[PDB]
């Protein structure tokens, strides 16, 4: 009913103010008592088992936040879509989990997913489709992939600056990415270009 629906909002207000004791509870009820209602195969289901795998990755359950969230995804592919948002949001959690627990191979799949999801949604243009980008190039940047660093970096840039204006900050702020992975691979000459290119516009600006 429409208890689930309060239920909810209070699962949140906890465990946004990092109150876990009464959010887990919440959410274990709320989860316990969706099932009674329409079984574990119900995208509500999901939606649960999304924010307990979030305060579960957040208390540093990493192993249990991971099937909390295979679980989510598995219902929400049956349920809503293998091609819907709400499939690449859970794919995003996955490869972030994964990320931050340092397995960057085992994340990247996930992520290059979620990307190929975003497009189809929101456009192969798109500056959430150049925010994907940006995670996807860090990813690759922690497995020595500077091939594909360059080219996912360089791709949001120009996503970046046809759809807003060159003066945005995530042009500045993805220029700084594609710099500073320059460096680590050794490519100073061209690092130093891409820096003289952002201290211009700023200057730029001034006048
Ligand atoms: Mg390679």
Known sequence: ???????????????????????????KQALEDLEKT???????????????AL???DQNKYKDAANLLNDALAIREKT????????????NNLAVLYGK???????????????????????????????????????????????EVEYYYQRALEIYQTKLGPDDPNVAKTKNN??????????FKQAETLYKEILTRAHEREF
């Open 1 to 27: 009913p429409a208890r689930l629906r309060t239920l909810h909002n209070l699962v949140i207000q906890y465990a946004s103010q990092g109150r876990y004791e009464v959010a887990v509870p919440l959410c």
């Open 38 to 52: 329409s079984g574990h195969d119900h995208p509500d289901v999901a939606t649960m088992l999304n924010i307990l």
């Open 55 to 57: 305060v579960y990755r």
């Open 80 to 91: 809503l879509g293998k091609d819907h948002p709400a499939v690449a949001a859970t794919l």
């Open 101 to 147: 627990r340092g397995k960057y191979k085992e994340a990247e799949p996930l992520c290059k997913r979620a990307l190929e999801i975003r497009e189809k949604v929101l456009g192969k243009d798109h500056p959430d489709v150049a925010k994907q980008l940006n995670n996807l190039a860090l990813l690759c940047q922690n497995q020595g992939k500077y091939e």
């Open 178 to 187: 594609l710099a500073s992975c320059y460096l680590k691979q050794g490519k």
